[PDB]
Design a protein around this ligand. Structure first.
Ligand SMILES: Cc1cc2nc3c(=O)[nH]c(=O)nc-3n(C[C@H](O)[C@H](O)[C@H](O)COP(=O)(O)O)c2cc1C
Ligand SMILES: Cc1cc2nc3c(=O)[nH]c(=O)nc-3n(C[C@H](O)[C@H](O)[C@H](O)COP(=O)(O)O)c2cc1C
Ligand SMILES: O=C(O)/C=C/C(=O)O
Ligand SMILES: O=C(O)/C=C/C(=O)O
Ligand code: NI
Lengths: 313, 313
């Protein structure tokens, strides 16, 4: 009667769920666990050309309303994720996204040049992270529309495949417009993942009178409950403004209902970060059944039936 | 014993609490209620030169985690708030801030010209709102650094008094820096209120499969629980970067503990929006009591003892 199936980017997904990049997808064991999970897909930790230890700990804190982190791109390096995609990932189980977060345009160019062949041969799909908010002294690329255009230009020039972009949240229609205008100039950008963390929040523990993460004086990306309306806004903003592109929702998904909201806003895939961090990949079984339960209660049979159909007043 | 006293801009405030601009401060009755309340101060609704009906309703929605609104600056017009400040407000009770949100730099300039005499004579303090995120086709001025510098230059030229600026949240250190650099060019900007709403979130009611406010396709400013870490981040970011200025915290204050966090982040005054909307002016008795209780438990006697003293790791 019902189906969470998603068909996009020449792939079939059992369901729209996947991990948010950076959550439970850094190590082989994590990637395998994500592959073995009920998720429709997975995306590997945002990689840099070489392994990165990331920021000093503590760099993640679970919170009643979500999470704050300043991980700082700890990752095994591009070769590692490329090898996973090329040699290890069971594409028979589900499609794979590889998140890339070069620290400069040059780094993204170099990795993309090498990713090209593996994408061709294996079908791994690039999610280009333009919104890492946690590397000290590195602005979120997509908050600088010139840096964003330049990065997309460079990747589009060297990378002979469609890819997606992991976007920071924007908070003004002027920015939705400006970002969408730029994204629409790149036909290879076939999906937009909205959103990365709400950047550089500051959690203060009233008990300790201190921040809760070490890097950057305690400023870190916010995820979880905090970010859901912002995520939905961005999902919908780009869903509307980039009609030639898919939107992947990310932000504040804890339940099938939250996922339902993402899809209603226009999400094709739904990424799960904080909730997954706290619950582990078993969450995908829960989220699939919950989303199905929501759809059953609402008498929806497929995601196509309500994707992007949020009613305005 | 303990004091919530705040001293700034030649004024004594019984406590740091005040309404957030736009909340319960549009009408004479509201302004009188705010004045009669236990709040340390109050700010009048952001005004435009002439009255504004504001955006179509529904334009405010209380939420489990806060609020979303697209009020669209409904206000009685500058003359009205000017007259309140000039003729009606009992300054014997508490200092008064007047929030100004002209839709253009010229509108602000013209209002400031006329506000100048009332500020001189009565001591009303301008809070210049550069962060209205709800007027369709009008971007948040403070997201345009050139426009903000321009506006502050234009206002400073005609306004021979100290004033503050109501800021939107920023989400990247590069923007904290850029914004702080601009604000630091203006010695008359003696306070910075961080933050206005997290702009243009989108609340979707899963049950109705619809947005919850009418203007701008449901996109509206987020307040309340959603915004606290962002508010704290901005308060602290500007606290650090504008040591010559005071910071007024605004965002996510429901309790004395929240207020304590604002102050720890660097807030001198603490503004209360969503919580005040949802509880009314009696909230200030609660908040003062709670903040004193927090301070008592933490063995602080004055706000100066911990203002801005959030410990980093
Ligand atoms: C610990 C942690 C690591 C993350 N790493 C990445 C990353 O490497 N690349 C990326 O694009 N986003 C990363 N994110 C952001 C998530 O992908 C996601 O956008 C964000 O957490 C919002 O979703 P959520 O509310 O479900 O947490 C990370 C988030 C967390 C909490
Ligand atoms: C109904 C409503 C009206 C508001 N009107 C104004 C306004 O006129 N000027 C302004 O600077 N901020 C206005 N705000 C934003 C608040 O001043 C405050 O920045 C925001 O709500 C965050 O505080 P909170 O979390 O306590 O709600 C308004 C907020 C709400 C909810
Ligand atoms: O590794 C991190 O700090 C997170 C990056 C991101 O949110 O893109
Ligand atoms: O009147 C409003 O819509 C809100 C204004 C603000 O947040 O500055
Ligand atoms: Ni911004």
């Amino acid at each position: 009667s019902m189906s969470l199936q998603v068909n996009l980017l020449n792939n079939t997904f059992a369901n729209p769920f996947m991990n948010a990049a950076g959550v439970m997808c850094t190590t082989t064991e994590e990637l395998v666990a994500m592959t073995e999970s009920a998720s429709g897909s997975l995306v590997s930790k945002s990689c840099t050309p070489a392994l990165r230890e990331g920021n000093p700990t503590p760099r993640y804190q679970a919170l009643p309303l979500g999470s704050i982190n300043s991980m700082g791109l700890p990752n095994n390096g591009f070769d590692f994720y490329l090898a996973y995609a090329a040699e290890q990932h069971d594409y028979g189980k589900k499609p794979l996204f590889l998140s890339m977060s070069g620290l400069s345009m040059r780094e993204n160019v170099e990795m993309c040049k090498r990713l090209a062949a593996v994408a061709t041969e294996k079908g791994v799909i690039l999610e280009l992270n333009l919104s890492c908010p946690n590397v000290p002294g590195k602005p979120q690329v997509a908050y600088d529309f010139d840096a964003m255009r330049q990065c997309l230009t460079a990747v589009s020039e060297v990378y002979p495949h469609s890819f997606g972009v992991k976007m920071p949240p924007y908070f003004d229609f002027a920015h939705f417009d400006a970002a969408a205008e730029i994204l629409n100039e790149f036909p290879k950008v076939q999906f937009i993942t909205c959103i990365n963390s709400i950047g550089n929040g500051l959690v203060i523990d009233a008990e300790t009178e201190s921040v809760v993460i070490k890097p950057k004086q305690g400023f870190g990306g916010l995820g979880g409950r905090y970010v859901l309306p912002t995520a939905l806004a961005n999902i919908n903003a780009f869903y509307r403004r980039c009609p030639g592109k898919l939107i992947f929702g990310c932000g504040g998904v804890y339940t099938g209902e939250d996922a339902f909201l993402h899809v209603l806003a226009g999400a094709s895939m739904v990424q799960v970060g904080t909730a997954l961090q706290e619950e582990g990949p078993s969450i995908f079984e829960r989220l699939t059944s919950e989303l199905l339960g929501v759809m059953a209660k609402k008498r929806y049979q497929t995601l196509d039936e309500f994707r992007g159909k949020v009613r305005t007043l």
